[PDB]
């Protein structure tokens, strides 16, 4: 059995760390909900 416990509020933090690119990718979505690169 799976159970849930609370981990925080949904809120934008104004002084948050910034990281990560913005890549543009061509992908297919199979019937299983799995992405793959084309």
């Amino acid at each position: 059995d799976m159970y849930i416990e609370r981990a925080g509020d949904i809120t934008w933090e104004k002084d948050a760390e910034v990281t990560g690119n913005s890549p543009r990718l061509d992908v297919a979505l199979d019937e299983s909900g799995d992405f793959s690169l084309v």
């Binding site: 059995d1 799976m2 159970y3 849930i4 949904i10 760390e17 690119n21 979505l29 909900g33 690169l37």
Partner: protein
Amino acid sequence: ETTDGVYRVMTRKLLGSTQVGVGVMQEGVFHTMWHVTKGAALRSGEGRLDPYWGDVKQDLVSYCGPWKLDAAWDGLSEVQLLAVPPGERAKNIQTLPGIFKTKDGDIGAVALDYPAGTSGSPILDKCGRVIGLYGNGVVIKNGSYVSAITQGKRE
């Protein structure tokens, strides 16, 4: 418990307490990714949360009601992954999304890497609205991880 907010999805079937994913409670509806729960029911204290709507292809599932989260990335501004990693506290992390170009349309993608257990973490806009959930993407020509901004269709 039914308070709006972000939650961890835990289990005791493996060694100790293992976090399998994350979800968003909003308007009395629990929202997570399908592959986190496989669609099985969930416990929230003494109470039971039962699946209500699900789609493996979207990799989304909601509990106690229809999918409530209806905000979308604007395609311009940056967003925040409210990452909730196993063993660690919720940390906002800001990114400009890139784009998954698919035959059926383009969708935002966040290029942030976090262990499984963080699947279902919400992606937010500057206004605080949940524009999608993290944890279903690809691995790029390097070896890192790019998740889609997976959002559902409200009623």
